[PDB]
């Protein structure tokens, strides 16, 4: 899936469109009106991440053998 995200990031008709560059895997430093290269204004610091919910916990339980190792949380 990260290779698939790389492939979907590099199709040759959306890559010219500047909305998939400011979202889907390119640094936003091409936008010229911006603060300079600081230690805190990198792209990964202003990236997105998960919101941890119960169903995701159940998904993690199903990968990590929750019927055997952690039975009370699985049930």
Partner 1 sequence: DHVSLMDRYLVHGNEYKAVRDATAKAVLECKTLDIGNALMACRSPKPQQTAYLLLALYTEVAALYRSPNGSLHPEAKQLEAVNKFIKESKILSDPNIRCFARSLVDNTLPLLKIRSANSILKGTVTEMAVHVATILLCGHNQILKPLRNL
Partner 2 sequence: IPELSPLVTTYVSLLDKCLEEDSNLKTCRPFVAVMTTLCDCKDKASKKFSRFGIQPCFICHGDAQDPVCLPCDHVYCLRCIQTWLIPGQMMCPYCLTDLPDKFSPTVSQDHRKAIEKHAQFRHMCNSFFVDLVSTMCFKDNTPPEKSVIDTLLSLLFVQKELLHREHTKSLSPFDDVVDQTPVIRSVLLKLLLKYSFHEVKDYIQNYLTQLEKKAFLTEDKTELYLLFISCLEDSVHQKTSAGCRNLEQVLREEGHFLRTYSPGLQGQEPVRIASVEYLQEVARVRLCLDLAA
Find where tokens 């919101």 sit. Answer: 51
- Binding part of the chain for partner 1, among 5-13, 31-39, 44-52, 55-63 by CB under 8 A, reads 5-13
Give 12's Cβ-side CA count (13 Å radius). 0
Q: Which does 72 bind (CB under 5 to 8 A by kind): partner 2, partner 1, none?
A: none
Asked if 13 touches partner 1 (CB under 8 A), the answer is yes
Report d(CA 48, CA 70) in Å as an integer.
30
The binder of partner 2 chosen from 7, 45, 54, 72 (CB under 8 A) = 45
Report d(CA 67, CA 33) in Å as an integer.
54
Residues that bind partner 2 (CB under 8 A): 35, 38-40, 42, 44-45, 47, 49
């Amino acid at each position: 899936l990260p290779a698939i995200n790389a492939l979907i990031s590099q199709d040759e008709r959306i890559s010219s469109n500047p909305v998939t560059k400011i979202i889907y895997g390119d640094p936003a430093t091409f936008l010229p009106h911006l603060p300079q290269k600081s230690i805190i204004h990198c792209s990964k610091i202003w990236s997105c991440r998960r919101k941890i919910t119960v169903e995701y916990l159940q998904h993690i339980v199903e990968q990590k053998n929750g019927k055997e190792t952690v039975p009370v949380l699985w049930h």
